[PDB]
Amino acid sequence: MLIVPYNLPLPGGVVPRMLITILGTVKPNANRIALDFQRGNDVAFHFNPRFNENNRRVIVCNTKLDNNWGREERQSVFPFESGKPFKIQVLVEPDHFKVAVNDAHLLQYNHRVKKLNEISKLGISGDIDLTSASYTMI
Ligand SMILES: O=c1oc2ccc(F)c(F)c2cc1CO[C@H]1[C@@H](O)[C@@H](CO)O[C@@H](S[C@@H]2O[C@H](CO)[C@H](O)[C@H](n3cc(-c4cccc(F)c4)nn3)[C@H]2O)[C@@H]1O
Numbered sequence: 803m804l805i806v807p808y809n810l811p812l813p814g815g816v817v818p819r820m821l822i823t824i825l826g827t828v829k830p831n832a833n834r835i836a837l838d839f840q841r842g843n844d845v846a847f848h849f850n851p852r853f854n855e856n857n858r859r860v861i862v863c864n865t866k867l868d869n870n871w872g873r874e875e876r877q878s879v880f881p882f883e884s885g886k887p888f889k890i891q892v893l894v895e896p897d898h899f900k901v902a903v904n905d906a907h908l909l910q911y912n913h914r915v916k917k918l919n920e921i922s923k924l925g926i927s928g929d930i931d932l933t934s935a936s937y938t939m940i
Pocket residue numbers: 834848850862863864871872874876
């Protein structure tokens with residue numbers, strides 16, 4: 803059990819082989835979730851499930867640089883369900899973040915922000931009950 807929004811420090815930033823695990827439960831009438839891997843004010847990797855964007859469910863990924871969002875990458879595979887417990891795993895790989903939900907691969911997101919060891923915070927926000935947020939090296 804954790805207060806949302808939650809900030810998880812990533813000491814010394816991220817590195818290939820680092821695995822971030824987020825456990826929570828989606829609220830009953832959810833509208834959105836967001837993970838924000840941040841490099842200061844920049845968002846290296848924004849992972850944003852939207853439950854009702856024109857009555858469709860979509861995952862939006864993006865990067866924010868100098869307060870400007872870039873080109874979205876969109877995924878229609880949508881593994882989250884209002885009311886249900888989930889596990890998000892984000893594995894840092896050399897060329898991308900690799901995301902699996904509930905043990906099934908979901909998407910990868912190529913590194914736009916190159917200075918991995920400056921991506922030193924993860925913000926977790928939105929319509930969830932947050933159970934845990936942690937990391938380990940595999
Ligand atoms: O940081 C926050 O904190 C919160 C706290 C609370 C809370 F309630 C919140 F909602 C928040 C939200 C954010 C950040 O949120 C922002 C981030 O998610 C950001 C990521 O890109 O998106 C913006 S939205 C964006 O506005 C844009 C123009 O401005 C466009 O409209 C664009 N877009 C692309 C497409 C599209 C359609 C068809 C095909 C196709 F290929 C693409 N259709 N629309 C559209 O996505 C959003 O606002």
